[PDB]
Write a protein that binds this ligand. Structure first.
Ligand SMILES: Nc1ncnc2c1ncn2[C@@H]1O[C@H](COP(=O)(O)OP(=O)(O)OP(=O)(O)O)[C@@H](O)[C@H]1O
Lengths: 292, 337, 48
């Protein structure tokens, strides 16, 4: 995909088809989630779910990974593309948080697709305090008349009511870390929340004031290197408290999604902070759990 | 000369010339010149305030050919000629200016305001080349009058500081004619005929040409300083980032061949992030301006290492050895290209 | 084929057409595009 050249030069039917692509994908996972949550009891619905897991998760995951890693897509996502993306995020996150045996089969595909979504999506949806500053925001771009015309909640919180706020997300992840609960009780947090938070902070590092102190309080989002050190610390404490049993390659998944954060943090901050995990590699030599 | 004016451009052109001379006499009135028998700055008066028919036919003529030649340059630069709809041209947009801005001319000074038209960035890029061509036309005309460049303008010796390449042209006159060309092309498009900008060629000239035939110089230490055993270190400071190669060469290295092309030199090209010995592989990253490259040679086990601002440069794999194995031969000396 | 699949007759007139498509056209897409991936991403930003 080449979003720049497509958006600046492209034929209108191709434009409409490329919006209709993710619009159809959006309605696909919407009806999929509705019918699976309604289907508490047990072939069309099974066909839809199978198509979802086989293609929709790979399609959206690959596309959104490409968008996020190449960091572009900004002009690709404009009028009605944002609302398609908000519907998709609401559905996927609300069902990646909800627990069901049907989800428990492809949790990890969700755990990596939701993370890719977090990287690709260009508007700060965890924070709404300074969200109006962000120029790319469909709220700011679309103007009052069109926002009233369109089926829009007119409140940023009402757009994504299911999702929680970022600050209470990280305080709850700190609470869960200090509690030292096992992966079995509430897996969903440690297969989706951690990947999305790390991909989110990774994309918006440079948007934060720590890289560009100028235009103070005109910042779209507010975030700090100390918030990142807290994140890496409680990730290490999660991979610490959780070593005795249950092993899991989700160790390796969370490690690879946190590879960006540990790469972009300073080596001096690496010292005296990550030496615990190197020495634990020796402390868990008798153990079979794989780390890093 | 080879191109001709299509009939559509022509029958819009007479009105374009009318509008251009009108805009000229009104810019004349915001500059403030008045109507008089003779032109003089102190008298602040000028006979060409009246319309084209009453305006001196000599100046009417010069306005008209410079307009036609300008639009022939428009067509000759590859501008995509096109029309949205002839109704847009049939509905010429005709506001009135305020009474103070009204002049001796019965018709209005500015039928169309620059506000409702937003010229395309490609259009301003085009008008940049249009300004280049207009300036060059004026320059050749003055050369053929006999004028030549001089830092001080002298009418006696026909010296003009303005006879310089447009890249070095004065900012004041540059922006003055540049805004005149802004408004000219903006009126051209807004009058109804929306000319489409040519293809924005992204091809890079790459600056292949260089002074004389020589393309690089090789700097090396004296052959007597060749090292056959031991561990040695020397640094290369890159003042500017570009096509440079630094490393170790044998005393038989050719001064006209690139370092690393033959077997007589071991070099590191950070411009392409490549090692060079009998060909090129991928090694390390690229340097920026001011980066310092430290070259290590261990002539005991025949290894070579490179650094960029201190950190070890590494292969495609994790190996830190730029060249694992080589014979001692007659020794090695520091070298750069 | 969706029309004829709802119908009783599952005989497919275009079976060799879709055989050709799926087993030739699709894989050559993958191979060509993975071989010239950089060719499309290059967007006047001067890669290669
Ligand atoms: N040959 C001419 N006959 C009559 N009027 C002329 C002639 N050439 C120029 N003018 C008048 O002078 C005006 C601007 O002069 P012009 O642009 O030719 O000056 P120039 O010699 O290029 O100036 P500079 O001193 O900046 O080099 C024209 O708009 C016109 O009114």
């Amino acid at each position: 995909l080449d979003a720049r050249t497509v958006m600046k030069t492209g034929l209108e039917s191709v434009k409409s088809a490329l919006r209709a692509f993710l619009d159809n994908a959006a309605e696909d996972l919407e009806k999929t989630m509705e019918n699976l949550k309604q289907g508490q009891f047990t072939k069309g619905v099974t066909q839809i779910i199978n198509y979802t897991t086989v293609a929709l998760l790979p399609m959206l995951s690959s596309l959104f990974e490409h968008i996020g890693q190449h960091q572009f897509g900004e002009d690709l996502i404009l009028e009605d593309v944002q609302v398609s993306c908000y519907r998709i995020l609401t559905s996927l996150y609300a069902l990646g948080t909800s627990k069901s045996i049907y989800v428990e089969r492809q949790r990890s595909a969700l755990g990596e697709c939701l993370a890719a979504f977090a990287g690709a999506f260009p508007v700060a949806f965890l924070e709404t305090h300074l969200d109006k500053h962000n120029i790319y925001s469909i709220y700011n771009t679309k103007s009052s008349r069109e926002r009233a015309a369109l089926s829009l909640p007119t409140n940023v919180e009402d757009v994504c009511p299911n999702i929680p706020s970022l600050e209470k997300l990280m305080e709850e992840i700190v609470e869960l870390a200090e509690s030292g609960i096992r992966y079995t009780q509430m897996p969903h947090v440690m297969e989706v929340i951690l990947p999305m938070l790390c991909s989110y902070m990774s994309r918006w590092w440079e948007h934060g004031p720590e890289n560009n102190p100028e235009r103070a309080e005109m910042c779209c989002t507010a975030l700090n290197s100390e918030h990142m050190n807290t994140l890496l610390g409680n990730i290490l404490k999660i991979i610490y408290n959780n070593l005795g049993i249950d092993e899991g390659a989700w160790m390796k998944r969370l490690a690879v999604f946190s590879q960006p954060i540990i790469n972009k943090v300073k080596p001096q901050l690496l010292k005296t902070h990550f030496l615990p995990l190197m020495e634990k590699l020796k402390k868990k030599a008798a153990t079979v759990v794989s780390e890093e | 000369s080879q191109i001709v004016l299509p009939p559509h451009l022509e029958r819009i052109r007479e009105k374009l010339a009318e509008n251009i001379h009108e805009l000229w006499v009104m810019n004349k009135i915001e500059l403030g010149w008045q109507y008089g028998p003779v032109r003089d700055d102190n008298k602040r008066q000028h006979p060409c305030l009246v319309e084209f028919s009453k305006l001196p036919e000599q100046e009417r003529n010069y306005n008209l050919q410079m307009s036609l030649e300008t639009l022939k340059t428009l067509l000759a630069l590859g501008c995509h000629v096109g029309i949205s709809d002839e109704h847009a041209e049939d509905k010429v947009k005709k506001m009135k200016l305020p009474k103070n801005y009204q002049l001796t001319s019965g018709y209005k000074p500015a039928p169309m305001d620059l506000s409702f038209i937003k010229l395309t960035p490609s259009q301003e890029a085009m008008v940049d080349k249009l300004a280049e061509n207009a300036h060059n036309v004026w320059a050749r005309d003055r050369i053929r009058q006999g004028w030549t460049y001089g830092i001080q303008q002298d009418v006696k010796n026909r010296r003009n500081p303005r006879l310089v390449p447009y890249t070095l042209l004065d900012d004041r006159t540059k922006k003055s004619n540049k805004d005149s060309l802004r408004e000219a092309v903006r009126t051209l498009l807004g009058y109804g005929y929306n000319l489409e900008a040519p293809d924005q060629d992204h091809a890079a000239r790459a600056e292949v040409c260089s002074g004389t035939g020589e393309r690089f110089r090789i700097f090396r230490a004296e052959k007597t300083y060749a090292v056959k055993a031991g561990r040695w270190y020397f640094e290369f400071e890159t003042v500017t980032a570009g096509d440079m190669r630094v490393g170790w060469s044998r005393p038989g290295c050719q001064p006209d061949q690139e370092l690393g092309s033959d077997e007589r030199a071991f070099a590191f090209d950070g411009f392409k992030a490549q090692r060079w010995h009998q060909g090129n592989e991928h090694y390390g990253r690229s340097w920026q301006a001011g980066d310092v490259v430290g070259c290590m040679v261990d002539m005991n086990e025949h290894t070579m290492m490179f650094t960029l601002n201190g950190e070890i440069l590494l292969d495609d794999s994790g190996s830190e050895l730029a060249f694992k194995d080589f014979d001692v031969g007659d020794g090695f000396i520091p070298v750069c290209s | 084929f969706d029309g004829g699949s709802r119908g009783k007759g599952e005989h497919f007139p275009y079976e060799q057409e879709i055989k050709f498509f799926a087993k030739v056209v699709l894989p050559l897409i993958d191979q060509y595009f993975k071989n010239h991936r950089l060719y499309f991403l290059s967007a006047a930003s001067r890669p290669l």
